């Protein structure tokens, strides 16, 4: 179930059996590479990029068309973000919650939720230090956290 | 439920160690208060008879249970000892040496005698059994 609730939903995506790109997909690996880098340099993270290529340009999945995960594409071209995507978004939500909290100090539900989000941040940061995607010295300040993102 | 991990030996062993204190027999033998008891971890003890008192029996019965209050030689404590037989109280005299034992039940009162867990077994170096059965006299 959910890490920080009692929800037990199973809604998610189901990729097909077929690994290869569909018959009707005619675009070549270099053009898709070019679209990915173009959207990246514009500031889109791999999830938004994948949503774009699914929606506009009729790419089901890049790993089926090009053979390489989109993050690996962004890394090879030196364009992956410094703070991983999910940690980036957790940091941004924690900052939003804290900013809300200084304006409502008796809103204890948001204090509970802030604790939950910082817990999630610490767990994901533990993972990232362990697997060498962050410096072994990166640590999360409540104070100087808005400078990093947004 | 119970911990089952392969690397859980400390948890199981420490848990048993903590929980054994919840058991009255273990705690009775491992806490040390038996050395504070009259006999101080002994089967028998010798004493001097201080007086003869006589005690009633509890409700379902009705009788006078004839006991002698003794002072233990080894530690100076004062206890009451039942004198088991018909007429054996008349063997007991004042200020004579007497050998006392437990009543059974290991320090807990026996039968209908209230608060008595000791019994007289020898007087003046001679058995109450031999005096009640006329085998020897004092």
């Amino acid at each position: 179930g959910r890490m920080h609730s009692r929800g037990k939903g199973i809604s998610s995506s189901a990729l097909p059996y077929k690994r290869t790109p569909p018959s009707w997909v005619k675009t070549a690996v270099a053009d898709v590479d070019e679209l990915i880098t173009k959207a990246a340099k514009k500031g889109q993270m791999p999830s938004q990029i994948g949503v774009l290529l699914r929606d506009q340009h009729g790419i089901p999945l890049v790993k089926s068309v090009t053979g390489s995960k989109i993050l690996r594409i962004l890394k090879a071209h030196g364009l992956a973000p410094e703070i991983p995507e999910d940690l980036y978004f957790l940091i941004k939500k924690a900052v939003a919650i804290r900013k809300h909290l200084e304006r409502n100090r008796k809103d204890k539900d948001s204090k509970f939720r802030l604790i939950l989000v910082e817990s999630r941040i610490h767990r994901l940061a533990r993972y990232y230090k362990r697997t060498k995607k962050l410096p072994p010295t990166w640590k999360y300040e409540s104070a100087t956290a808005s400078t990093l993102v947004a | 439920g119970k911990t089952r991990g392969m690397g859980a030996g400390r948890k199981l062993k420490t848990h048993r160690r903590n929980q054994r204190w919840a058991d009255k027999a273990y705690k009775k033998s491992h806490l040390g208060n038996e050395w504070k008891k009259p006999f101080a971890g002994s089967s028998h003890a010798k004493g001097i008879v201080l007086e003869k008192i006589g005690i009633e029996a509890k409700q379902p019965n009705s009788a006078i249970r004839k006991c002698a209050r003794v002072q233990l030689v080894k530690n100076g404590k004062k206890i009451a000892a039942f004198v088991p037989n018909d007429g054996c109280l008349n063997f007991i005299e004042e200020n004579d040496e007497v050998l006392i034992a437990g009543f059974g039940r290991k320090g807990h009162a026996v039968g209908d005698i209230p608060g008595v867990r000791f019994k007289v077994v020898k007087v003046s170096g001679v058995s109450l059994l031999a005096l009640f059965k006329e085998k020897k006299e004092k």
Partner: protein, 128 residues
Amino acid sequence: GRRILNDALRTMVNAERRGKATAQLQPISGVMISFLNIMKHRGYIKNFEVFDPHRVGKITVELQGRIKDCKALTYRQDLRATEIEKYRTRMLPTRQWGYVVVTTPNGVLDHEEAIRQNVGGQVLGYFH
């Protein structure tokens, strides 16, 4: 919350006890397949199939109606060729039938082949 070879064997006991002819094990592994081979070679199940859609896997087993109980010894103890005897007394209904499955550097195999080949290992489960 998952440690398979318990869900597989317990799904099989439940299905066999209801008299079903087909059972389906969602997460598979080589350990499960190796166990099921011992089951078949000793005669307690019919043939079975791996369905690979892609993932961990999936298998369907054909139940012959002769298995009574098959379970796992999770907390897989270390089990040498001399204390085989005492595990099988603790765990099998008699000296005549039933098998304890042990994983050994010579593969996964039942306790009798282990006695013959003179190797110990770690206990996985039993069936009888």
